[PDB]
Write an enzyme that holds these catalytic residues in place. Sequence first.
Site, short mmCIF file in Angstrom:
data_model
loop_
_atom_site.label_atom_id
_atom_site.label_comp_id
_atom_site.label_asym_id
_atom_site.label_seq_id
_atom_site.Cartn_x
_atom_site.Cartn_y
_atom_site.Cartn_z
N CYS A 234 -4.03 19.48 -32.87
CA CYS A 234 -3.23 18.30 -32.38
C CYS A 234 -1.71 18.39 -32.94
O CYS A 234 -1.51 18.48 -33.83
CB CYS A 234 -3.88 16.91 -33.24
SG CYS A 234 -2.96 15.61 -32.86
N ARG B 129 0.16 14.95 -34.92
CA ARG B 129 -0.07 14.68 -36.43
C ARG B 129 0.84 13.87 -37.20
O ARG B 129 0.39 13.59 -38.30
CB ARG B 129 -0.87 16.15 -36.96
CG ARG B 129 -2.20 16.50 -36.37
CD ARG B 129 -2.65 17.71 -37.37
NE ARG B 129 -2.16 18.76 -36.59
CZ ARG B 129 -2.17 20.00 -37.41
NH1 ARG B 129 -2.52 19.91 -38.57
NH2 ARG B 129 -1.78 21.15 -36.86
N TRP C 88 -1.86 8.03 -28.03
CA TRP C 88 -1.55 8.07 -26.62
C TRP C 88 -1.44 9.29 -26.12
O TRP C 88 -1.28 10.23 -26.80
CB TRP C 88 0.06 7.13 -26.57
CG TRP C 88 0.94 8.07 -27.78
CD1 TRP C 88 1.77 9.13 -27.64
CD2 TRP C 88 1.30 7.49 -29.06
NE1 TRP C 88 2.46 9.50 -28.68
CE2 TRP C 88 2.05 8.26 -29.55
CE3 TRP C 88 1.13 6.28 -29.47
CZ2 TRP C 88 2.73 7.70 -30.65
CZ3 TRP C 88 1.46 5.93 -30.93
CH2 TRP C 88 2.35 6.88 -31.31
N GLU D 207 -0.90 16.51 -20.40
CA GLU D 207 -2.16 16.15 -20.54
C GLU D 207 -2.80 15.99 -19.15
O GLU D 207 -3.64 16.57 -18.54
CB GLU D 207 -2.88 15.48 -21.46
CG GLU D 207 -2.62 16.02 -22.87
CD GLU D 207 -3.12 15.10 -24.16
OE1 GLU D 207 -2.35 14.24 -24.42
OE2 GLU D 207 -4.34 15.08 -24.53
#
Lengths: 362, 362
Positions: free
Chosen positions: A65, A68, A237, A242
């Site tokens: 991630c 973070r 979000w 992506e």
Amino acid sequence: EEKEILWNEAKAFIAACYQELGKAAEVKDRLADIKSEIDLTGSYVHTKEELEHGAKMAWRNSNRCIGRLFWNSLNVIDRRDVRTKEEVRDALFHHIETATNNGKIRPTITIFPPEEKGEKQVEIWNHQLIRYAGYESDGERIGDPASCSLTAACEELGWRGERTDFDLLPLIFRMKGDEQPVWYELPRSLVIEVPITHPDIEAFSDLELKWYGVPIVSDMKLEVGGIHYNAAPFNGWYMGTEIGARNLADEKRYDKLKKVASVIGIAADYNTDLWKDQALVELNKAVLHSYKKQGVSIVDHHTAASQFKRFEEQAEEAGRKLTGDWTWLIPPISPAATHIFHRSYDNSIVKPNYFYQDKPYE
Amino acid sequence: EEKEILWNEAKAFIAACYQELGKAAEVKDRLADIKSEIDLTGSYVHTKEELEHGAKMAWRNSNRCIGRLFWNSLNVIDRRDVRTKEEVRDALFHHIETATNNGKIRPTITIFPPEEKGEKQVEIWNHQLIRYAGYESDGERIGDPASCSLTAACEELGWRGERTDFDLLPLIFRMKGDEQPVWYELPRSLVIEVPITHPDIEAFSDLELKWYGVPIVSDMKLEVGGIHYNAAPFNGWYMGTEIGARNLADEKRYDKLKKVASVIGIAADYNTDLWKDQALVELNKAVLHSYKKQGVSIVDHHTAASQFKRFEEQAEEAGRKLTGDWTWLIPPISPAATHIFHRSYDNSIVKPNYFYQDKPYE
Ligand code: HEM
Ligand code: HEM
Ligand SMILES: CN(C)Cc1ccc(OCc2ccc3ccc(N)nc3c2)cc1
Ligand SMILES: CN(C)Cc1ccc(OCc2ccc3ccc(N)nc3c2)cc1
Ligand SMILES: CN(C)Cc1ccc(OCc2ccc3ccc(N)nc3c2)cc1
Ligand SMILES: CN(C)Cc1ccc(OCc2ccc3ccc(N)nc3c2)cc1
Ligand SMILES: [Cl-]
Ligand SMILES: [Cl-]
């Protein structure tokens, strides 16, 4: 045996969690009362505080991630009290609403009853609470191919999609005791979608692209101090890449690059023209523009990387070892333009954390 | 002890090399005569055939190389006979000439006398035979910052750069016996350079960008069957991203993205405009266009990936285990648009191979 692995994970978690919470002296007794409850019951129950913080630690330890930095502001919803499928449904509905927040997305996790005997109380079939159906039969490809097996499963259970490229899958989960899951169609008023337009190129609307505002990953197990919350959907979000570089661009997904190159008015004939690279940039520009234009939170990969650099700095300052998965942290476009590309990361697994678990369908 | 590690590496190499060459029965005796030469001399000498094939195997085993499909057509030049610095210079000069081949680049390696006692016969200081100098002093940055320490070293030895952003470094190497290396200025007629222009945007020439045609990596050690060829410069042709996405784009290199965004007529003000990503694409388009326009070989990252997929297929078909370094195989632009991104690779080290070795300067 199982009673043991539970105890050790409990000692490790409580120690670290109470340390961070500024409650180091409370450990001794809390740890003792836990050890008792383990002997007596075969398990133990987290306080609201332990659970909230545990979920936060879990995000912080997610090697893949990039987002973070905001681990500590995660909004934790404690739904361990649900017993019925109407409650599970309504909690999921509520998650969507509060997390969406009219477009100003709140990173949220809803936490359901954990596994008891390793036996699930609730089992969510959706990969995300909001996703698009997908259909492959007789040379006809419709919607999201990644959703093909789940779509076909829902259609066994009495659901039927309209077979647009953007059919919203129903919520589908199964309760303990019931041999079969139930499914509930999603109220459209709950689901924000964003039409994809380009800031400069008017023709881009001819592609009739859209995506949902909030990615709510719902098939991962949260593990906190030896307790397995297999049902705990969470969201942040989106990072634009992506949607623009993967969901819409991947050949095995929506596969739009050739269509994108056409509307932006360039040839898709030669590798040396880098038409794919160019298509990817304009599509990714388009995605960011559209989300901002509508009032739906989103971050670009450069800002995201800058934030993650701060996370690195904040981690070392706090005397915490940083862990990360380089192959997932670099963004799929211009990774060498981010600091992430130019350093390495330890990929060790620290708990609490989020884990894959086996799918019930397929 | 050293005699042992030499023998085992020799057994492994000769076996595999004679197998591939269709000379499996010749092993027994060649292996026996080697074992003798090891006992007697403390080393052994490769035949032209063994060496040629060894260099080829070494390229084939280079985990980080995307260009491995053409491993078998490597042009091997055997210069183990050189004894003098004039010979070393002339061999290096010749390498440049034949490898450049008027722009139709031949992947070539020149192989010099190997390490004897672990003692070098020749030691090349250049990272590449052709590279640009770099200067950092008093807020003034000139040329390639990656070449800063080598440039400063050459300037200790009596060389002086004109302090353009593209000063060609001299060849600098050291012979066994000599405490200091020598340096020789490069004849401009030997070095092909490519001015960077854009196919569509005329203003792109205002950046006065250029690069050299042939990357000739000269600081790596080739290891073939226990023999260490520390001096063995090799080359291929460039993949455009090496120039457009790294050498010219990296902040710690030429750092041109802001200037690129200006000439292409877009703002470099907001992350969400993805101006860096856009700059990277046009610059990379520019590089490919310019190399093709001049007649200098180059490959784009998509074609390169397609070739490497064939390499994967050719490897499995031949019954050979494939090895690779995913983090180096993906190209720094649009990696998710290549198949490489979507699979994984074993990063094991197989010999023969090319290795890093410690720099003599610094
Ligand atoms: C707040 C905004 C957030 C952003 C922008 C963000 C960004 C990302 C991205 C881009 C990925 C890679 C996805 C992929 O390539 O498939 C990722 C992975 C992940 N994120 Fe986040 N994230 C955010 C919040 C969160 C939150 C709130 C959690 C959980 C509490 C979380 C947990 C994870 C996990 C577990 C993964 C890895 C999933 C896997 O291994 O497949 N993230 N994040
Ligand atoms: C023929 C065209 C070739 C192309 C297009 C090509 C492409 C590449 C690229 C793009 C890299 C990564 C460079 C970086 O990011 O720093 C690489 C690495 C490498 N290539 Fe190739 N290559 C070619 C030929 C060769 C040849 C002829 C050899 C040796 C005989 C070779 C050996 C290597 C090695 C050893 C590395 C890794 C160097 C390191 O670890 O730093 N390649 N190749
Ligand atoms: C279906 N799984 C077995 C594969 C799989 C599962 C979860 C995955 O999560 C990706 C993920 C997780 C959390 C996120 C939070 C925010 C965000 N923008 N993307 C996020 C993306 C990815 C793949
Ligand atoms: C933790 N650092 C001090 C050590 C370290 C940092 C980055 C490392 O690699 C990052 C990395 C990854 C992929 C690359 C691909 C090409 C290239 N030229 N450099 C690349 C560099 C390796 C070691
Ligand atoms: C100075 N070193 C310690 C770092 C270093 C050494 C060799 C390196 O080689 C990269 C490399 C090697 C061979 C190549 C062949 C063809 C090509 N287009 N690029 C190529 C690029 C890279 C970094
Ligand atoms: C050898 N395969 C059968 C197993 C395998 C293949 C690719 C794997 O990862 C590639 C990879 C690397 C980075 C990624 C980043 C984001 C993302 N969504 N997928 C990503 C996928 C992992 C395992
Ligand atoms: Cl997604
Ligand atoms: Cl280079």
